Design a protein around this ligand. Structure first.
Ligand SMILES: CCCCCCCCO[C@@H]1O[C@H](CO)[C@@H](O)[C@H](O)[C@H]1O
Lengths: 149, 48
């Protein structure tokens, strides 16, 4: 999946692994981690969520008390918009005939959270579904592809 | 010795034009497909 992003969004921000490079981890400094928390770990961009046997009100209180952010300028209160990521129809083939099995992933660009179509797309994905060696269903599974599989 | 003469050349004309136009179109299409392989980049990253 990394390689998938790595080439599907090649040249952009999304094309990076979460764990990052080796050179980065070998050299990242106290400063950077600090500055990262400082620049990103900010109130307007956080969300305290909770569920179970709790009082919404008591929760909001505890929050007001310990989540005491101070915002002066407009900068602090603004939620940055990220520079778009370009999708590129391409491929990356990492071969090693010494591995037991092969892995393949194919994809097209998606709409993104906002779009209502995401619903339809998930319905679609349900028609094809998924399968694997231990499904008891077998040759009778409703998913055409699982059958053939 | 060859009555066709005239028609044979009128054809030769049509042949050049279509031939010109067509060789071009197909030269693109050939390059189009092949691009995949022309631009291709490979690297040898043995494990360490
Ligand atoms: C690959 C190149 C194909 C060339 C196709 C040209 C077709 C020839 O065209 C011919 O022209 C003659 C005079 O204009 C007519 O009398 C013929 O009926 C016609 O078939």
């Amino acid at each position: 999946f990394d390689y998938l992003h790595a080439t599907a969004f090649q040249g952009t921000a999304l094309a990076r692994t979460v764990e990052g490079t080796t050179e980065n981890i070998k050299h990242l400094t106290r400063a950077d981690l600090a500055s990262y928390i400082d620049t990103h770990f900010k109130a307007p961009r956080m969300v305290l969520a909770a569920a179970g046997g709790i009082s919404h009100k008591e929760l909001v209180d505890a929050a007001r008390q310990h989540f005491s952010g101070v915002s002066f300028t407009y900068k602090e209160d603004a939620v940055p918009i990220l520079p778009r990521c370009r999708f590129t129809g391409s491929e990356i083939r990492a071969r090693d005939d010494a591995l037991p099995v092969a892995h393949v992933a194919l994809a097209v660009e998606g709409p993104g959270w906002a779009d209502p179509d995401n619903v339809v797309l998930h319905v679609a994905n349900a028609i094809i579904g998924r399968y694997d060696r231990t499904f008891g269903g077998g040759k009778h599974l409703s998913s055409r592809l699982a059958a053939l599989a | 010795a060859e009555p066709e003469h005239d028609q044979r050349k009128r054809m030769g004309l049509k042949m050049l034009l279509i031939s010109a136009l067509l060789t071009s179109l197909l030269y693109y299409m050939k390059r189009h497909k092949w691009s995949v392989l022309k631009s291709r980049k490979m690297a040898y990253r043995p494990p360490k």
